[PDB]
Structures are given as structure tokens and as C-alpha cells.
Amino acid sequence: SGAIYVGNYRVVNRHLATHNDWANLVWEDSSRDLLVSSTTAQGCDTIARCDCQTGVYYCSSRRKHYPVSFSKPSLIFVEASEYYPARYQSHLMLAVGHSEPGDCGGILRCQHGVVGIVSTGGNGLVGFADVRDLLWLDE
Ligand SMILES: CS(=O)(=O)c1ccc(Br)cc1CC(=O)N1CCC[C@H](C(N)=O)C1
Ligand SMILES: [Zn+2]
């Protein structure tokens, strides 16, 4: 579980969004597994605007942060689940690192700020849904 709080926005995995998130919906994209809802309180997370391919992510199944090299956002095939049929997830980045069900929502950060959140994984890999192209989160 986990979310990004920037300005008047909350960014969470779309498959884990709550009733409040859907009642206060700003934007959602099932192909990216992302949903953004509005908040009354102000958020101070900084979003990175870069093309970093290294960073650090939070892994809740280990209560630890790990450094990773990750790929550029692209379309990657993702297996069926209680949340989605089999499909290509877009804007997804892969890294070699530990992740297991329950880890979605962990933040990936580089020196510039928040890069994305855990969205997929398994087999010694971890997948992150990128948020660096959503320029409107800041303004
Ligand atoms: C594939 S797994 O070994 O069950 C796993 C491992 C790590 C992590 Br983080 C998570 C899982 C499950 C997984 O990737 N899901 C379920 C939730 C929605 C995801 C999606 N973006 O379509 C796909
Ligand atoms: Zn960066």
C-alpha cells in the first residue's frame, strides 16, 4: 500500500483506489494502473522531472529501501489478476529487486524527487508506474 501526496492531489495505484478516491476523481488510466484524487489538505512531495534510470525504492515486505537501476517507461505485458485481465501496462519501468503482493504503492525516488510507485513485480523483478510525465500534478 502507499500513495504520493503533491499539492491538492493524491496519486495511488488504480487497483487499490478507495471510495473517497473515486468520489473525488481527477484522472485515472487503467492501462497505467494509476488514479489521482483531490484532497483538501496540502501535500509537499516533490515530483521529479528528469530521465533518471537509477534511484531508491521502498519495499514494505522487507521494511527496507533498496537502490535500483531501472528501465525507461514502456509497454510491458502483465498477467491477469482479480483487478485486471491480461494486457500491456504502459509507462512501466522494470528493475532487478525484491517485490511481492503487498508491495504496490512503495515510492521510487531519484535525487530530483518522486519518480513513481510500485505497480507489478515477481521473479526477482519490480515494476514501477512512472509519474514524471504528469506535469499537471505541480500546477
Ligand atoms: C505477479 S506477483 O508475483 O503476484 C506480484 C509480485 C510483486 C508485486 Br509488487 C505485485 C504482484 C502482483 C501483481 O503484479 N499484480 C496484481 C495487482 C495489479 C498488478 C497490475 N499492475 O496489473 C499486477
Ligand atoms: Zn531524476
* 112 annotated to a ligand binding site: yes
Q: CB under 8 Å to 82, separation ≥6 — which residues?
A: none
Last residue of a domain, one of 28, 44, 60: 44
Same domain, 89 and 130: yes
List the one residue out of 122, 128, 9 whose CA is nearest residue 58: 128
User: Residue 41 burial by CB count (10 A; 0-12/13-18/19+): exposed, middle or buried?
Assistant: exposed
Does residue 82 sit in helix, strand or coil? coil
Same domain, 36 and 77: no
HSE-CB of 84 using CA atoms within 13 angstroms: 19
This entry's atomic model was obtained through X-ray
Same domain, 55 and 34: no
Is 26's C-beta closer than 6 angstroms to any atom of ligand 1?
Answer: no
* 50 annotated to a ligand binding site: yes
Same domain, 37 and 97: no
Same domain, 114 and 70: yes
Q: Which residue has the cell 504503492?
A: 105
Q: In what order do the strands lie in the sheet with 107-110?
A: 64-69, 54-59, 107-110, 113-122, 125-130, 87-96, 74-78
Range of the domain at 10: 3-44
Task: Report whether 47 contacts 34 (CB < 8 A).
Answer: no
Same domain, 109 and 127: yes
Distance CA(84)–CA(86), nearest Å, equals 7
Q: CB under 8 Å to 13, separation ≥6 — which residues?
A: 33, 34, 35, 104, 105, 117, 119, 129
Q: How many domains does the chain fold into?
A: 2
Distance CA(119)–CA(91), nearest Å, equals 11
Same domain, 26 and 56: no
Using the mean position of ligand 2's atoms as its centre, give its distance from the Cα of residue 13 in Å. Answer: 21
Task: Report whether 78 contacts 84 (CB < 8 A).
Answer: yes
Same domain, 61 and 102: yes
